[PDB]
Amino acid sequence: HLCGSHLVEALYLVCGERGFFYTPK
Amino acid sequence: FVNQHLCGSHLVEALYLVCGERGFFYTP
Amino acid sequence: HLCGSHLVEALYLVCGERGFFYTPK
Amino acid sequence: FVNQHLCGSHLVEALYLVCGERGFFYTP
Amino acid sequence: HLCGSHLVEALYLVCGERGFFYTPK
Amino acid sequence: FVNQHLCGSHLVEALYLVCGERGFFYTP
Amino acid sequence: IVEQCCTSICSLYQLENYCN
Amino acid sequence: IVEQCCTSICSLYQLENYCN
Amino acid sequence: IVEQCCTSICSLYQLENYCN
Amino acid sequence: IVEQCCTSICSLYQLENYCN
Amino acid sequence: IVEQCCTSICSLYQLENYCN
Amino acid sequence: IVEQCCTSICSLYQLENYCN
Ligand SMILES: NCCc1c[nH]c2ccc(O)cc12
Ligand SMILES: NCCc1c[nH]c2ccc(O)cc12
Ligand SMILES: NCCc1c[nH]c2ccc(O)cc12
Ligand SMILES: NC(=[NH2+])NCCC[C@H](N)C(=O)O
Ligand SMILES: NC(=[NH2+])NCCC[C@H](N)C(=O)O
Ligand SMILES: NC(=[NH2+])NCCC[C@H](N)C(=O)O
Ligand SMILES: [Cl-]
Ligand SMILES: [Cl-]
Ligand SMILES: [Zn+2]
Ligand SMILES: [Zn+2]
């Protein structure tokens, strides 16, 4: 269960070197 | 740059709160 | 919804350069 | 001092847990 | 109430200099 | 090493997600 | 603080209030 | 993202999808 | 650990137990 | 963002330039 | 606190001096 | 882990060597 800033933290573990988009809606 | 990588961790947390329902884009 | 350490993280984004008090009760 | 600013982020998280219902004061 | 990564953060405040094991199950 | 201590904070968060129900061991 | 931002919803603009 | 990883459960492998 | 500190409430003093 | 914001302390306006 | 605690690793006693 | 991973950026394989 990955919600709020924890979802962003998880996105960063995986993609932080490549970069990513976060678009909740 | 390790200290930038650590720093990036903090920035995305800050963008998360700063941006709201709009979301954000992160890119080194 | 900003509770526990997330409320403190949010307080810090805004005030971390000025300083602040956190007094839950 | 960026690395102190990053460091401050960690300290307030630590004071949050350390202090309990008392709360804390943070000041550079 | 210390769950998920917050429990790990709390484990780290106390033990981060000594080291620790985290074994949820 | 302060910046390693800060760095350790990030590693355990990363191991938490990386490892799952297995858990992990942290040791300087 | 907790009522303003955890019970009710909050703004980063509103939290400027608590800066010392 | 939120459905995939907050509503339903997610994998770190599945989140590689969102890397730009 | 999870019962002690997530299910029941915990102390930072009690978590010294788990330091290796 | 890294260039601008891991160098000097950025401000909440520097940061808001990376909202969508 | 920054002076004392972002310089050397502080201890949980250094930190507790900033509780209210 | 500190030696390997606070020096260079580690990868998710370096990290997974510290799972139980
Ligand atoms: N005004 C400081 C906002 C802020 C919070 N965390 C940060 C991390 C890096 C940075 O450049 C800026 C920040
Ligand atoms: N005994 C280490 C406690 C601790 C946790 N995080 C910290 C950050 C800075 C510091 O000086 C100390 C700490
Ligand atoms: N592939 C980067 C994963 C990662 C996330 N956080 C980290 C902190 C330190 C490190 O060496 C590596 C990481
Ligand atoms: N570093 C992380 N992303 N940790 C995940 C923690 C899970 C947390 N209980 C949540 O609401 O998602
Ligand atoms: N960096 C932050 N303050 N994030 C806010 C995350 C919201 C979280 N679900 C909470 O209980 O408040
Ligand atoms: N830095 C920390 N460990 N903070 C504890 C925050 C409590 C959080 N609501 C939880 O699910 O546990
Ligand atoms: Cl939570
Ligand atoms: Cl850091
Ligand atoms: Zn949380
Ligand atoms: Zn950090």
Numbering used by the authors:
A (entry chain B), C (entry chain B), E (entry chain B): 5 to 29
B (entry chain D), D (entry chain D), F (entry chain D): 1 to 28
G (entry chain A), H (entry chain A), I (entry chain A), J (entry chain C), K (entry chain C), L (entry chain C): 2 to 21
Provide the authors' own sentences about this structure as they appear in the paper.
Insulin is one of the key human protein hormones that is responsible for the maintenance of metabolic homeostasis, with an influence on cell proliferation and regulation of aging. Insulin is a 51-amino acid protein consisting of two disulfide-linked chains (A1-A21, B1-B30) and exerts its functions through binding as a monomer to the (αβ)2 heterodimer tyrosine-kinase-type insulin receptor (IR)5 (10, 11). Insulin is produced from a single chain pro-insulin and stored in pancreatic β-cells in storage granules (termed large dense core vesicles (LDCVs)) from which it is released into the bloodstream in response to elevated blood glucose levels. The in vitro data showed that insulin hexamers can be grouped into three structurally distinct states/families: T6, T3Rf3, and R6 (15, 16), which differ by the conformation of the B1-B6 N termini of the hormone B-chain.
A similar set of crystallization conditions yielded crystals of insulin in a ternary complex with serotonin and arginine (referred to here as InsSerArgT3R3). Despite their similarity, two of these forms (f1, f2) (referred to as InsSerArgf1-T3R3 and InsSerArgf2-T3R3) are reported here due to a dynamic (i.e. with high level of disorder) nature of Arg/insulin binding, hence the need for more independent structural evidence about the nature of these interactions. Despite the presence of arginine, the serotonin modes of binding in sites I are practically the same as in the Ins-Ser complex. Some serotonins in site III are bound in a fashion observed in InsSerT3R3; however, some of these ligands are flipped in both InsSerArgT3R3 crystal forms, i.e. the -OH and aminoethyl groups switch their positions. Arginine is accommodated there in channels within the T3 trimer, parallel to the hexamer 3-fold axis and opposite to R3 trimer sites I filled by serotonin, which leads to filling the voids around Zn2+ and His-B10. The flexibility of arginine is concentrated mostly around its -CαNH2COO− moieties, which form weak alternative HB to main chain groups of CysB7 and HisB5, also exhibiting some flipping around the Cα atom. In contrast, the guanidinium groups of the arginines are firmly engaged in extensive networks of HBs, which link them with side chains of GluB13, the side- and main-chain of HisB10, and the side chain of SerB9. This simultaneous binding of the two very different ligands to the T3R3 insulin hexamer polarizes this oligomer even further into two structurally distinct trimers, Arg3T3 and Ser6R3.
